[PDB]
Design a protein around this ligand. Structure first.
Ligand code: MTB
Ligand code: MTB
Ligand code: MTB
Ligand code: MTB
Lengths: 116, 116, 116, 116
């Protein structure tokens, strides 16, 4: 119940996720930023038996039927329930690059998701 | 099956992955370190229509039938094919923590996966 | 003028800094968290001719005359001036470890400093 | 003078460092990549009374007499002495950006410094 729902981050991107009983995360991500259009598939895992926040992570490869940014983002963080449910994350966005440019292929950031 | 196969990181953990034609990564991760025992389910996404490196990412929630570390790792990187194929990643390991310890809930590192 | 002053982060830690004309940052950091007591020396660099925020970074080795945590934090971010002056950062906290534990030696986080 | 010396990262950038008895790191960084030309001033801190690795960090603001990248890199890691001495780091490169591009202002990577 907790994780499953629609969330939004500070950028206004939309994350629709279903937490399966087997610890699977599935849904779609609708981004507000970058070189994206439409929704993108997400897949992740979460601690289906947490103790403390619930650790989770998910990945989006920024490719759908419309665009390809040749990049993928991974969000690693934790779900914290209560009145105000939130997912606090740190993310890595890696772009496919030639060997010469790989040193600067990864962006790091942080996103806070609020459940709607 | 560039990405599909068995890879090993510097630690000697085993990453068995199947890359779907659609951009899905699925498989098992057998760690050689941390508070784990057994194999863990992984899920990810990758650029199924790359340009030079192939962007990808995956998550492992550190819970199996045997144990629960109440944490999850996300790996973000790129697969580089050729004679000596590699997956160069950066990872984020977030532990489920109280709100008091949330500031130090996430570890960052890098992993190089090879087929040897 | 901008950078020089007293700042505080979300944890209530105190950062007292002087920006030199040569791009030098010097001051002391008074932490609210970890295994710290008293002030610690900080040293950093900043873009003394910015265009956009002003890029900067500083390091604190968590050792003073009272305690030693055998760890150092680096904050990398940017100063943004105006009504509400702020320093938005991402940080790395590395602990000295044996070779066996080096894989999990680095914490990553984010701090927002408000000028007082 | 374990740390004091000249080191090179995988890219071939040169790090000339002097470690003060007090925990200060001072020196010059000559990059072999990015938007730079010449040497850059670096400042950092390190654990002057280590336990097994020696925690340290430093910053370089990418501004010299010749150019200004309006960015700064912070390296956080540990020095490991012995026959084949190394400085294993993770770094954060933040560019001064508008508020609109701040979410993607920071790159993350890893550098291994050796004396060869
Ligand atoms: C516009 C589109 C979504 C496809 C796009 C997104 C992108 N990184 N996005 C993000 C990255 C990290 C955290 C959040 C987002 C976020 O979107 O909430 C990079 C290129 C790109 O084209
Ligand atoms: C032992 C067990 C697997 C459960 C476990 C693993 C763990 N992160 N491991 C890793 C993290 C980053 C990169 C590689 C691995 C790797 O293992 O290859 C953290 C806590 C923990 O308990
Ligand atoms: C208590 C003392 C400060 C010495 C201490 C601090 C510490 N990391 N601190 C931080 C780390 C990253 C960002 C901010 C802080 C911050 O303090 O604002 C780790 C061990 C420790 O003992
Ligand atoms: C070329 C010039 C030096 C100015 C420059 C450098 C730069 N980051 N470099 C690095 C970053 C991380 C680790 C090593 C280096 C290294 O150079 O060894 C980013 C933009 C830029 O313009």
């Amino acid at each position: 119940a907790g994780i499953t729902g629609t969330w939004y981050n500070q950028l206004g991107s939309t994350f629709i996720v279903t937490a399966g009983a087997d610890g699977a995360l599935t849904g779609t991500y609708e981004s507000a930023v970058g070189n994206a259009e439409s929704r993108y598939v997400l897949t992740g895992r979460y601690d289906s038996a947490p103790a403390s926040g619930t650790a989770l992570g998910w990945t989006v490869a920024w490719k759908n039927n419309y665009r390809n940014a040749h990049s993928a983002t991974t969000w690693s963080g934790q779900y914290v329930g209560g009145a105000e449910a939130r997912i606090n994350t740190q993310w890595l966005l890696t772009s496919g690059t030639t060997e010469a440019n790989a040193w600067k292929s990864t962006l790091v950031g942080h996103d806070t998701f609020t459940k709607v």
